[PDB]
Each structure stands twice: as C-alpha cells, then as structure tokens.
Design a protein around this nucleic acid. Sequence first.
DNA 1: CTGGAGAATCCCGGTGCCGAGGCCGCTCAATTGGTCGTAGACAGCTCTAGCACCGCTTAAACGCACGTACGCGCTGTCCCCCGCGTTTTAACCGCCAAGGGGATTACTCCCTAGTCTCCAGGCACGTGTCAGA
DNA 2: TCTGACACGTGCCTGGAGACTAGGGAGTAATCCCCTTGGCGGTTAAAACGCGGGGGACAGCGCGTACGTGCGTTTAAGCGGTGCTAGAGCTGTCTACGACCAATTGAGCGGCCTCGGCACCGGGATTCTCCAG
Lengths: 93, 92, 102, 87, 98, 87, 82, 78
Amino acid sequence: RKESYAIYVYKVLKQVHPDTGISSKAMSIMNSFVNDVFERIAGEASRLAHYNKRSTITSREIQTAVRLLLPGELAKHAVSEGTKAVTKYTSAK
Amino acid sequence: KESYAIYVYKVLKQVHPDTGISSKAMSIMNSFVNDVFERIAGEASRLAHYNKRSTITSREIQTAVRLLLPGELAKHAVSEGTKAVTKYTSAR
Amino acid sequence: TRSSRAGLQFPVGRVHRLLRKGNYAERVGAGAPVYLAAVLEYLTAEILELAGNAARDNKKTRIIPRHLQLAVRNDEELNKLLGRVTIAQGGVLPNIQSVLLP
Amino acid sequence: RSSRAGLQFPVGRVHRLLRKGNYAERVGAGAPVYLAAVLEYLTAEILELAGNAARDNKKTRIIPRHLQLAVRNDEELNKLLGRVTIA
Amino acid sequence: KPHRYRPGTVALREIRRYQKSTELLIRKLPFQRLVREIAQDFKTDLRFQSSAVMALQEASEAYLVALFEDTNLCAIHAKRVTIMPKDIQLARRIRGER
Amino acid sequence: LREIRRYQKSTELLIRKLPFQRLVREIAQDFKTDLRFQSSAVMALQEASEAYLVALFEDTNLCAIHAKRVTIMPKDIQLARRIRGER
Amino acid sequence: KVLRDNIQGITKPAIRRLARRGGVKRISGLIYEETRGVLKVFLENVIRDAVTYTEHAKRKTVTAMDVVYALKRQGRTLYGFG
Amino acid sequence: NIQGITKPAIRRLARRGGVKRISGLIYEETRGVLKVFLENVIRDAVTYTEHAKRKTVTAMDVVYALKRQGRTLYGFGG
DNA sequence: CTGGAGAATCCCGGTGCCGAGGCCGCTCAATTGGTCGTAGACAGCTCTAGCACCGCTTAAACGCACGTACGCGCTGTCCCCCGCGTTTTAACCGCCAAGGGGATTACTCCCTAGTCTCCAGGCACGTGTCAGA
DNA sequence: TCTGACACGTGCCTGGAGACTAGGGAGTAATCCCCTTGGCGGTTAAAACGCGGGGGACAGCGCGTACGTGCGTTTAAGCGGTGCTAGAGCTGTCTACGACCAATTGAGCGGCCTCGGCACCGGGATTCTCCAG
C-alpha cells in the first residue's frame, strides 16, 4: 500500500483545478510539509503551554501561537478562514 | 531563592566557606542551567521520537549530549557520568 | 463523519489523530484542528494555484523543481516561516540581480 | 539518591524539572543521574572559573563584568551560547 | 565560423539554463560509494539509500545556493562581484553560528 | 582608556529612568492599549535594546572591518538584519 | 496621558558609548535615527509578541519575565532577568 | 578517496545552483565547508545508527540531521 | 553603431514507457453519550507597588566653536581564473539473481509511574560583621 | 571612605526518596526480500592538456568632512517626598469540562489494476545574440 499527507492536497487541487496532475516528489513535499508545520505549531503551543503555566493545551494557545508566527495576510486568512471555519463547526458538539 | 542557588553556593561553600556573592549572578546561572537543560531534554525527546523509540534514558541523554556538545568534555561527561551511574548502581 | 460536519475537506479525525498521537504535552485544542486545517488548506490552495498556473504557462500540468521552489517562495510570509528550510527538488529562484548579470 | 550517588548536584530536583518539562512518560533508569553528573562536570568547570575569576581582584564575587571576562574569554559554551547577554 | 562565445555567455547559460532548469547533475552511485568510503571509518557493513544520496545531492546544491547568495551579498555590499575566502567564511559566520 | 575604559568599561544601564521609561510607555501605547512606569521591566527593555545593538553593531562592525572602511552606510545594517532575518 | 517624541530617550551619547565602543570612526548623525528605526522594528517585535504573551496572561502591568519570553521567542534569550 | 568528488562537476551543480563566478581559492576551502557540514550529517547519522540497531540508514535520518542542523529538506517523508 | 545564422530553446502532437489515474469491501480507526475522570477561572481583595502625587538644582543630555581627521572615485595596472574541444578512463546505463540479514511478524523477558509514608535540607524572616555600598 | 545582606539560624515547610501496585516494550527467533556478491555488455560523464581570449579588485592621488572635545547649560530627573489603592496571587468553591468505552460505522485499507500520463520522439517553430556590418 501507499501513504502520504497529500491525497487530500490533490483533492483540494481538484476542488480548485479539476484537471491537473501531481508529481510524486510534490506529494512527499506536501507530506513532509504537513508534518513540519504540524510539529512547529504544536511546538509553539507547547511553549506557550509552559508560558501560560497551564497543564492544558486548548485552541487559545494554538490560535495565539499562529498569531505569533505569521504576521499579516496569513493572519487575514488565518482568523478569517481559520476562525470562520471554527465558527462553521463549533455551533454544535 | 527559587533557583539552582543552594547547590551552586553549596559547592561554592565547599570550595570557599566565607563567600559573599549576589542573587543576580545566581539568576544568570538559573537561566543558563535551565536553558541548556531544556535544550538537552528536548533533544532526548525528539531523539527517541525520530528513531521510533518509546524509551528515553541515559542512551538518549548520552547521544543527545553527543549531538549538542561532543568532544573531550563529552569524554569526561561519560567518564564521571557513566562511572557515577555505575557507583549509583552499586552504592545507594 | 465529523470532518464533513466541521465543514472541512481535510479529515478532522485524522488531524486529531496527529494531535493525540503527536504527544506534545487533559485535551488538545478545541477549534485548533479546524483552525490549522483551514489555514493549511488555504496556503495549500494558493501554492497549488501558483504551481498549476505557472507550470501551465509551459503547457505542463505537474510541478517541476523550478516550479516547486518558485511555488513555495512566491508567498513572502510563507517564505518568512520557511526561511531556514531546504526545498528538496527546488534548484533556484528568479532572484537575478543586475550584479548577478555577467 | 543524589548524595547516595555520591554527587554534588540533586538528581531529584533536575529530574523533577525533566518530568515537568513533559517530554515522555518513560523517564530513564539513570537518565537524570547521568545528566545531573554531566552538569555537575561542566557546572563545576564554570564554578572553578567563578572562584578564579572572583579571586581576580581579591574578591569572592564574580559580577557581569567578570562574567564578560570569563564568557568573552570562553570558547566552549560561548561557542555554544550565541544570542545570550549577561546583564 | 568557430562557434566560440563572449566572456559571460557561459555564465549567461548558467543563469538562463542553469538558473532556469533546476535538475541534479552528478551521478549518485560514485558519491554513494564515497559515503561508503567515508563511512568505513565508522562501522562495518552499513546499508544506505539511493534516496539518502539523492538527498545528499539536493542538500548539496541547495547548500551551494545559500552559500552562494550570502557570499554574493558579502561581495556586493563590499563592492565586489567575485567571491573570496573572506566572504565565504564570513558568509558562514554572519548567520550567527560563528 | 577613553575608548576601552570610558566607552567600553560601562555595562550598567545608561539612561535616566522616567524619559525612556515614557518612551516604553509611549511606543507601547502605539501598539496595544501598555508597558508602564515599570521599574525592572523597562530596564529589561533598555538592556535588551542595547544588547541587540551590541550584536547588530558587532556583526555590522565585522562587515565594516573586512570591507576596508571604518565608517558606516545603511546597507551594512540592512544586510545584518537580512542575514539574521530581521528585515 | 498624551506622549510625543521620546525617541531621543535612546540618547546620542549612549550611542557614543556603545557605537564608539565598537571602534567605528565618524559614526554619522545622518545614520543615528535609522539605527533608532532598527531599534523601532526590533523593539516593536519583542513588545509585539510580549503583549500577546501578557494578553494571554491577561495582565495589565507586565512583568519582565514576559520580556524574557519575548526575546526567547526570537532565540535572543539573555541572562540576568530570571 | 575524496577524489570521487569531481571538481568540474561540483562546478556544474554550482552553476545549476546559480553560481556566477568561482575564484581559484574557493575550491579547496569549499571542500572544507562540505567537509565539515558533511562530516556533521554523516557524524550525527552515525550517532543515530549507534543508538538504534540498524545497518540501513535512511533519507529520513538525513531529514532528522538537517532538522538538528537547520537545513531541513522535504520530499522524502517524515 | 545595428542585426541576423545558428545553436540553444520551446510547442504542440502522438503514444503508450508505465505512472497519474483507477476502484470497491472492509477494516482499523473511530462517533457519541454517560460515567468516570478532572483543571482553570470564578469574584473579591492584600499589601507591594499602581496610578495618581510633588519641588528644586545640578544630571546627563543638548548645544556652540574649534578642530580634526576619514571614505571614495577616475584611471591605470597589470592581473589569472575560465572555457573550447575532442577524448579522457574507467564509470554509466541498463540487467540480473539469489539468498542474507533488512524489514516484518512473533516470542520472550521483562514493566516503572503514582500515591503515600519518611524525612530532612531548604525558603522567608530575623542579626551582624566582615563582607557590603 | 563609610556600613549592612547573606552567613547563620529559626519557623515552616515541601519536595526528594522509597515501597507497594499493576504494569508493557525492546532484544531476538523466524520468514520473505532489496540488494551484496558476482557477472554482463554496450554507451558514456565529464574534464587533463593546450589554445584562446578578456578580466578583478584595488591603490596613487586628491577631495574632503563631521561628530567629538571643550566648555557651558539646563529643565526633567535626582533626590527627596505622598496617598489611596492597582493589581498578583491568593482566596474556596462553584462552575465547568474531558477520555474510554458501550457500541461500531465509514472512507482509507487491502487489494489489485489501468490506459493513457507525460517522456520520448516528430517535426517544426523560437530566439536572442555574438560575431558580421
């Protein structure tokens, strides 16, 4: 079998560009990229989890950590796409 | 003092029983030992993480120190550190 | 599943699996996986947009190392978050200075 | 167990900071023993530097002036600590 | 009739072709054998990856990209278009490692 | 003695507390409504600032020394901020 | 309550102490305010992530430990403040 | 046998890396630069090998090493 | 001074080399509500310092007149590392095989964190000279 | 020259230390396998040596220029001097929240494939440029 973190990446690619191919090297770029970005963000959430002196990591630490790492337009679509997406989910359980 | 105070001036009292010093340099060493401390401990954590191992012991500490600061300082570190571990394995 | 119920295209279950099995600490982030999935889906969408269109300017539909690195680096803030990274299959950038002209 | 390791520095204090640093649940069989012995070594090195550097001026105290003497004359940890200022 | 060039047209081919096309150029297997021979000083009968040595070529060329660009900046801020010992070493230094 | 001891021997903080403390207060208002008349924290701000000036002026200084100059042009601090990644 | 023009609090003779401590000669007055600009961007970065830190800590009178975490965020941790 | 490092081909991927001019002094010192950096990645690679019980190193191990050395590369997993 | 042959450089275009694409039951991960399991703020406020409180001369910055004291450009200068070019020598590309420990599955011996009891060095507070300002 | 906070000791801990108490992960045996050892053949990756050409940074020399020094000042700050409480940590707890599972259900997993994907020709079209005018 095969495994990567880019099958949903080319899914969203077909959501944006329905007739487009993908190189295998880019699939591993996306996989290593998702893991790298994940460990960085979870790292900063852990660091603030020290800083706030909580034994709990909730969404507050991650969101503010994202606010720490990316400055302006990533922040635009981060609170916009991120927070609005959280708004889209969190009305229910 | 919420620091490494008591052991630093403990051995400083072992070398100089009449010692006058300040808390500020002790805070400097507090940030130093805490800083290098979390460096080495984080290195052991990701060290066991990368090689798909669920154990962190003096091998992870040992090799982690070898990654952060090798050399003859590491040779004396495993010398007194390892022989010290041998002592603690024999004497408690 | 809850991933669709979150209004997500990315698997919220699998992302939460990265959270619990990632071991970077009673809970994990409440809205945080939705948040990160939204951001990563966004920046993913623009980088796929850049490689698809810019590569499509040469009639090709996949991403070459030139378009790999260029696709990554054409976002300035993503370049800031990835300033100390190495791009495997990247080659170079179009940063040709006039002093870089022979 | 620290004095019962015959060593100068605590294994339980440093071990408690290891645990509350929250790395993994499996703490080592002798991981804080060996780690505390290594920082016993190098901390003993910089404290011998503190005794000599304190005694530079018939004193028993190093100050950040003396810490700039030692660190700005240091190679190992001054190499290892780059972005660090002693106030 | 000899199709010889202008002094910089090779570097023009470098920027146009070699800055446009971005592929690895040195053969993986001899460098993999170099990793074997250098690896002889560590441990007997190690196995490697083709992908590890291709990663060595990738990290090698991107390494040359970073060293070349900050080496350039060290040259050009000092009003120089060529590269020296002092700008490669200083270029490595000014990151904050040295 | 002028440069080394007069210009280089001083390591204590150099500015009268209330004015630059109000610089900390003023600029701190200008981003989030506030660093205050802080006794030690404002001193940490000045110490941090001047230490950062030690770093940027020192690698800046090395860039000056190798480039056959003993004066400054802003391109040096721009390159230092570039290679550190401040810019 | 209203504060203007305190950038000269980073005084010129202090710039003589550290800048002339660096050994650089003819350190131009036309560059000092630009250096204060570098000070401006750096200090607003560390005050930036600092006020996000104490904003998470929801305190009104900021402690120096917040500044330590701020420099810590940029890897420029210094000794002598905790 | 470090002469497996073929210097004109090293110049070729230098050109591919965008290098515009190379002085004559650059070659041996660059062999020093790749010598130290390369001995770092093979070095810590060997430390990972000695801590574990494998004889087959991976490209992901090079990812781990570059993660320690601040030149992390994608495109191989991890 | 400009301006094309000509070698480096694309543009579809077909065709499958084979990889981007080709596809469904199931299973391993996994959704939902109670119990079990559980961590941080809750409003009010205490005493160090937060915000509001204040006068003068000398504190260190600001400013005037010597005065000094440093980079930077035109042009030469002779500098020197580079590239064409076929050929240079094993290495390259493509071909492979077959069991061995690599990779994987199974056996085996192991398996120390959590709570409480034991306990003793250590923290804030208080004296006082030689270390301290 | 002038003198007071940690050495030292005392309330008052409070975290090291250790023994139950269930508890689980790496070394290793065992099976297929990517390639190690050994074999194969044709094609080529790349670059010493010789010829060919321009090219790199940097000083001679001259212009030059500006903040520091010296001297003097100068109001906010130094230094001395206010007041009720701003707020940090604490106060007890409510107020409130969360994993595993009873129960299991759904898209990747497992399992295999595919047919045209885009690499390689096919032929043609760009292109810009460095040696010609």
